[PDB]
Amino acid sequence: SMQIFVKTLTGKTITLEVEPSDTIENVKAKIQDKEGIPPDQQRLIFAGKQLEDGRTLSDYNIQKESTLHLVLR
Ligand SMILES: [Mg+2]
Ligand SMILES: [Mg+2]
Ligand SMILES: [Zn+2]
């Protein structure tokens, strides 16, 4: 039942419920439910790296209570 956090540029904090197997595309689908940003307009960054829609959270060692950064495009 793992939680992660997404911070927008103006400091909003979105809490997501994810599994380490979830893909980044999944995470954007969850963010869309909460914020109303279509997945194609979302950039997610973690530890400096842009995250790719095909990889999973585990593929990036993103664990419980990690913070991802959300920027638009
Ligand atoms: Mg899931
Ligand atoms: Mg599952
Ligand atoms: Zn995509």
The two tokens of residue 29 are 């689908």
Taking the centre of ligand 3 as the mean of its atom positions, its distance from the CA of residue 72, in whole angstroms, is 13
Radius of gyration from C-alpha coordinates of the chain: 11
Closest ligand (CA of 17): 1
The two tokens of residue 15 are 């809490």
What's the rounded Cα separation, in Å, for the pair 25 and 40?
9
What's the rounded Cα separation, in Å, for the pair 59 and 73?
23
Ion ligand 3 neighbours (CB, 5 A) are 25, 53
What's the rounded Cα separation, in Å, for the pair 16 and 20?
12
Domain extent, residue 5, equals 1-73
DSSP string, 14-26: EEEEE-TT-BHHH
- Resolution in units of Å: 2.6
Among 26, 19, 15, 33, CA closest to 62: 19
Taking the centre of ligand 1 as the mean of its atom positions, its distance from the CA of residue 12, in whole angstroms, is 23
Number of domains comprising the chain: 1
DSSP code, position 47: T
What's the rounded Cα separation, in Å, for the pair 62 and 54?
15
Taking the centre of ligand 1 as the mean of its atom positions, its distance from the CA of residue 72, in whole angstroms, is 23
